[PDB]
């Protein structure tokens with residue numbers, strides 16, 4: 001079966017075959033499209049075909065499909081599953097596996113980078129204190145004094161589901177939020193619940209607008225423990241604007257390192273429930289989403305005020321004007337301080353070249369248009385006009401439940 | 412079976428039941444989502460009519476009444492003999508409004524019940540079609556106070572006597588390839604203009620030449636008519652601060668009118684059903700003016716504003732975009748031509764959604780089309796989960812007639 005996608009700006013048409021290897025479910029049916037929906041303990045029986053699918057893919061990628069080494073490896077894994085209910089990945093397989101989960105991550109606009117990923121193997125870790133040290137090391141390697149390097153740290157896989165490793169933070173670096181008695185929020189409103197958990201557990205909150213949260217780390221299904229990332233490892237950028245000198249007096253800054261810590265990495269049927277990964281920011285993530293979402297720092301009004309835009313009617317497009325100035329400021333600031341950042345034009349241009357390449361060498365590139373198109377200036381980026389196919393390839397990153405909802409407290 | 416949609420800005424969660432009446436297909440499956448793809452008998456007709464009449468009699472609180480049963484009987488009788496049926500005026504009007512109500516790609520559906528329906532089912536020739544359409548254009552234009560309207564020509568019969576308006580919209584600008592290598596006018600319309608010239612049109616060869624109408628009546632070869640110039644309201648584009656903006660010499664038409672869709676009601680197919688509303692500002696300012704395949708004006712504007720165009724990260728494209736959009740809205744508003752900005756329309760749509768969840772049990776919506784083409788996440792629609800599904804009565808894409816027509 002062949003599927004075509006067209007670009008409506010260039011009329012270029014691509015043909016997808018890779019979707020034939022798709023496995024998990026989309027949420028959609030012939031009667032309903034769920035394309036804008038944010039969120040839609042294996043038996044041995046289910047595991048060996050998953051392991052086999054993975055190993056065939058890995059051995060083909062190294063041009064050793066059907067070799068003695070491939071066959072011996074299938075037999076070795078088969079015997080390990082029947083006798084222990086699970087198996088262990090070789091380091092090479094873990095590396096291939098993590099890079100491909102990135103390659104396959106349909107909501108990721110950054111994928112032109114996928115083969116340049118530093119994989120830190122933390123499967124010998126046994127305590128939360130051990131997790132902290134691996135994470136500190138990840139953060140310092142990835143930050144690299146502003147010359148950011150993509151990386152992932154991989155903690156031990158799930159066993160019976162009662163011994164999970166998990167990073168309770170959604171991202172390694174985030175600012176606290178504090179709900180005041182009058183209903184106003186201090187800091188980042190989206191992190192109030194999690195800030196409360198950290199406080200309950202003993203965090204002494206500075207209670208300012210940009211307090212870096214502590215890590216809360218669970219090893220081997222034990223209760224999580226709190227650690228402060230050393231301030232000196234947390235690189236931050238004060239936000240200023242190249243023409244507007246009052247911009248700095250807004251008191252804004254943001255952290256350099258975007259790091260996701262709440263997703264589950266599936267490789268060959270194994271589940272890596274703690275697998276923090278980091279890259280570098282696209283400017284719109286901070287300047288549009290973190291700063292201007294009504295539920296986040298929500299600074300549009302203040303900025304428009306300072307610009308003396310006409311704010312009596314939306315049709316003056318004052319929000320749009322302020323939005324652009326904030327985003328200019330974020331890119332300017334990061335560039336000035338020599339911290340890696342990409343703009344949304346550059347990033348979406350790179351993505352389209354990446355996509356085209358994948359279609360030629362791979363037969364496809366699953367992509368989620370809803371997530372790929374940036375949240376400002378949509379149609380002046382080339383991905384807006386690009387038809388995309390969304391499907392699920394493994395290896396993959398998946399959502400999992402928040403651990404505070406499911407953890408069994410030992411006390 | 413029952414599905415939840417969440418708004419991620421407000422936490423409001425709604426429950427959709429209306430999707431269980433979804434009839435036609437999405438193009439998606441459990442293995443693949445095609446959400447971003449632009450274009451995914453007597454026996455067959457009676458169940459479609461029944462489906463429709465049931466919903467109609469339900470809507471006027473007479474379901475299972477005698478007049479309901481009697482109408483069902485009459486239409487069945489009529490299809491059994493004639494292989495088709497006629498809608499009553501009341502049914503036609505309900506049907507047209509509901510096709511708008513069900514239009515998943517339309518952000519302006521808060522207005523759905525306020526649609527003026529012009530019944531042109533008595534029309535027999537192309538000259539008649541022209542007269543009806545001029546009347547629609549004049550009515551809808553209303554000196555700049557725009558009013559929603561549809562005009563409905565005769566339904567498909569054996570499919571060899573289709574009425575069609577070959578034009579995609581009632582009002583569009585010509586495009587012309589130049590020897591110079593470039594394109595004059597609207598580059599999207601080069602092929603259709605050629606058809607018009609091939610059919611006799613004396614082309615002016617300017618940048619904003621309104622195309623003539625090519626009307627096919629009763630499966631006949633299409634004929635050419637020029638909309639009266641004094642009925643095609645246009646707006647010159649200027650900017651409230653940049654005095655140079657007017658020197659780009661831009662204008663656009665006030666009347667957005669789709670003319671290439673098919674209207675399906677109770678299994679009947681209306682292949683010519685031009686409809687019109689009013690513009691949302693981004694449509695012109697973002698798409699018509701700034702698409703690379705369209706008038707593609709960003710570079711010229713940027714230069715006039717003296718921005719640093721050396722690097723993408725100065726956001727010069729973004730800055731020029733916003734000003735072009737501010738100019739569109741100010742120009743329409745100063746001339747007193749109805750226009751809506753993307754903030755206002757999207758707030759309206761979210762109110763409409765809530766209304767439809769509360770009163771109908773849902774609202775089919777295509778997020779990819781609903782979220783505006785600039786400033787997405789500063790509008791409330793961006794944060795709203797939506798389910799897309801196909802209800803009837805509906806507006807559908809149909810093949811372009813130059814591909815289908817046998818001359």
Ligand code: HEM
Nearest residue numbers: 102105107108109110113150151277278279280281282397
């Ligand atoms: C190197 C530079 C990178 C850039 C510029 C980048 C860009 C992005 C952006 C802008 C998003 C959307 C974020 C949001 O709206 O919250 C995203 C999503 C994501 N990317 Fe990346 N990416 C990069 C690296 C990575 C790396 C290293 C990984 C994993 C190894 C990764 C995996 C993902 C995943 C899984 C998502 C989906 C997150 C979710 O569902 O919340 N990306 N990418």
Ligand code: HEM
Nearest residue numbers: 511514516517518519522559561686687688689690691806
């Ligand atoms: C009254 C003001 C109206 C507003 C502000 C409005 C707004 C919009 C907008 C912005 C689009 C997107 C167009 C594009 O990107 O090409 C759209 C699409 C559409 N609207 Fe409306 N609408 C209006 C009236 C109507 C009316 C009167 C009807 C039918 C009687 C209608 C049916 C549709 C349909 C079927 C589409 C999809 C067309 C396609 O696939 O190209 N709308 N609406």
Ligand SMILES: CNCCN(C)c1cncc(CCc2cc(C)cc(N)n2)c1
Nearest residue numbers: 171173258259260277278279280281282
């Ligand atoms: C729920 N999703 C939004 C999460 N969010 C507010 C957030 C906070 N802090 C950091 C990120 C990073 C998301 C991300 C991850 C990666 C690997 C790269 C990239 N450019 N951005 C996201």
Ligand SMILES: CNCCN(C)c1cncc(CCc2cc(C)cc(N)n2)c1
Nearest residue numbers: 580582667668669686687688689690691
């Ligand atoms: C080719 N895709 C459609 C965009 N396009 C080139 C176009 C040109 N001219 C007019 C329209 C009208 C779209 C429209 C229709 C209606 C009823 C209301 C509205 N606000 N916009 C569209």
Ligand SMILES: C[C@H](O)[C@H](O)[C@H]1CNc2nc(N)[nH]c(=O)c2N1
Nearest residue numbers: 384385386387447448449779780
């Ligand atoms: C590929 C993609 O579907 C295409 O560019 C769409 C995206 N969203 C859109 N949204 C609207 N309102 N109008 C459009 O023409 C498009 N084009």
Ligand SMILES: C[C@H](O)[C@H](O)[C@H]1CNc2nc(N)[nH]c(=O)c2N1
Nearest residue numbers: 036037038370371793794795796
């Ligand atoms: C409801 C909708 O799916 C939601 O607001 C999405 C839209 N697109 C997105 N795109 C990105 N990149 N990140 C997001 O958080 C979202 N949120």
Ligand SMILES: [Zn+2]
Nearest residue numbers: 028033439444
């Ligand atoms: Zn879908």
